[PDB]
């Protein structure tokens, strides 16, 4: 591979800054390109530079080169949440038709909400009765907190997810755990995972 | 603009299977990628112009034509649940100070599954917050439940008094496999709202979940006593309540 990236991955809060690396080999050098690719989406072109120029800006997003040493910076400012995702380095041998992108494998940033009061909590959301599920919502915990799988294949629990009520300009975690069977209680839901001693359960 | 038809595809095993890409740009380039969630791009074809067509850095089953700059088409002309997986085209053309700048579009979703039997629609349900929730923290969350769906081609939102709101909710990056140890398992999808206790005590607030399921079209056949898996909007509601 002829383009390389690093770090694999980061989880950075938000409002930092954070710097993003590329290293390549191709010769000859052309052009080098960053990327924006959201889940499920196509990748964006966030910044095109060529050796003629040393930095591209693109609203947050701050592109440097480096072509003697062949390495590239992306610099994030003022991160938000919106910027979890995938980060692509791609590099061009040359400006014609007949020249070739060349793919680095990317950059995965996570963005993590600033939680300065977390509050865990386990609450039963009240049965739907229009449906045979009971579900149970662990909420409110810190970024830290992992939430493990359940150890039975009739209870499905989903992982930490991040709401943003920008309004309150709250944050908060929050994972679901259903199951339609009579031995499902809340109190044991989220009983594989490790969770504060705090967590309140009403 | 650079454009992709269809957005989802559900086929069955064996099937022709054509995925259109077309841009009025007058760009020569274009690309075919393929992509399974959370792994890398890979190349999977390219083209020069007009008449051109040549393989990418991945092999595969899939062919393309060139006959004209305007369109790419891709085609499997027998589908396998291994072509299972997103299907972008870009093209890129000269723009300024001397370069090319790639466009990509909105791509197809394409499984392919063994039999048409296994499409199943989302059945949705939602659910009210707990009175817990709302005297401990003055907020209150719904949680909406897909669930029961095949293949995972699914959008969820909300809608709040007609309007649909992204502040204040979270949807499941991925859905929950039923069952983990199949390969056309069914799917669950968790989604949360979370708004002011005030908000949810008003009687007048009307709060809905709303699952779009991209299934089977008309022309597709249907031999089973069951209803038709066609693409559909499968939706469930809440109104306020004043404790």
């Known amino acids: 591979n002829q383009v390389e990236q690093s770090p694999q991955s980061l989880i950075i809060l938000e409002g930092k800054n954070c710097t993003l690396q590329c290293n390549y080999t191709v010769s000859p050098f052309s052009n080098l390109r960053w990327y924006k690719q959201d889940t499920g989406r196509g990748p964006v072109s966030l910044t095109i530079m060529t050796f003629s120029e040393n930095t591209k800006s693109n609203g947050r997003y701050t592109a440097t080169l480096d072509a003697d040493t062949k390495q590239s910076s992306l610099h994030i400012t003022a991160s938000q949440l919106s910027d979890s995702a995938s980060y692509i380095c791609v590099v061009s041998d040359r400006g014609s038709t007949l020249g070739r992108l060349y793919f680095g494998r990317g950059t995965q940033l996570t963005v993590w909400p600033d939680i300065q009061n977390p509050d865990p909590a386990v609450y039963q959301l009240r049965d739907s009765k229009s449906s045979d599920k009971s579900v149970c919502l662990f909420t409110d915990f810190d970024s830290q907190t992992n939430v493990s799988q359940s150890k039975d294949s009739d209870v499905y629990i989903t992982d930490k997810c991040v709401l943003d009520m920008r309004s309150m300009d709250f944050k908060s975690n929050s994972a679901v755990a259903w199951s339609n069977k009579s031995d499902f209680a809340c109190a044991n839901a989220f009983n594989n995972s490790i969770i504060p001693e705090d967590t309140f359960f009403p | 603009d650079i454009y992709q038809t269809p957005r989802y595809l559900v086929i069955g095993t064996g099937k022709k299977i054509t995925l259109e890409c077309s841009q009025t740009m007058g760009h020569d380039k274009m690309y075919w990628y393929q992509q399974d969630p959370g792994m890398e791009l890979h190349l999977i074809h390219y083209?020069?112009?007009?008449?051109?067509?040549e393989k990418g850095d991945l092999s595969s089953e899939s062919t393309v034509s060139r006959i004209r700059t305007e369109h790419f088409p891709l085609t499997l002309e027998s589908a396998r649940p291994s072509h299972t997986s997103q299907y972008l085209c870009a093209s890129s053309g000269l723009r300024d100070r001397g370069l090319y700048e790639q466009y990509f579009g909105p791509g197809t979703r394409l499984t392919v599954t063994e039999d048409l039997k296994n499409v199943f629609p989302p059945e949705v349900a939602v659910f009210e917050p707990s009175e817990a929730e709302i005297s401990h923290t003055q907020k209150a969350t719904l949680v909406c439940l897909a669930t029961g769906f095949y293949p995972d081609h699914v959008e969820l939102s909300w809608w709040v008094n007609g309007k649909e709101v992204h502040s204040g909710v979270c949807t499941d990056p991925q859905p929950l496999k039923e069952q983990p140890a199949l390969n056309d398992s069914r799917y669950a999808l968790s989604s949360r709202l979370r708004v002011s206790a005030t908000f949810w005590q008003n009687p007048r607030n009307h709060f809905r979940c709303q699952v779009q399921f991209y299934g089977l079209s008309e022309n597709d056949e249907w031999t089973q006593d069951r209803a038709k898996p066609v693409t559909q909007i499968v939706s469930a509601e809440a109104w306020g309540r004043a404790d």
């Open positions: 083209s020069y112009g007009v008449n051109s067509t």
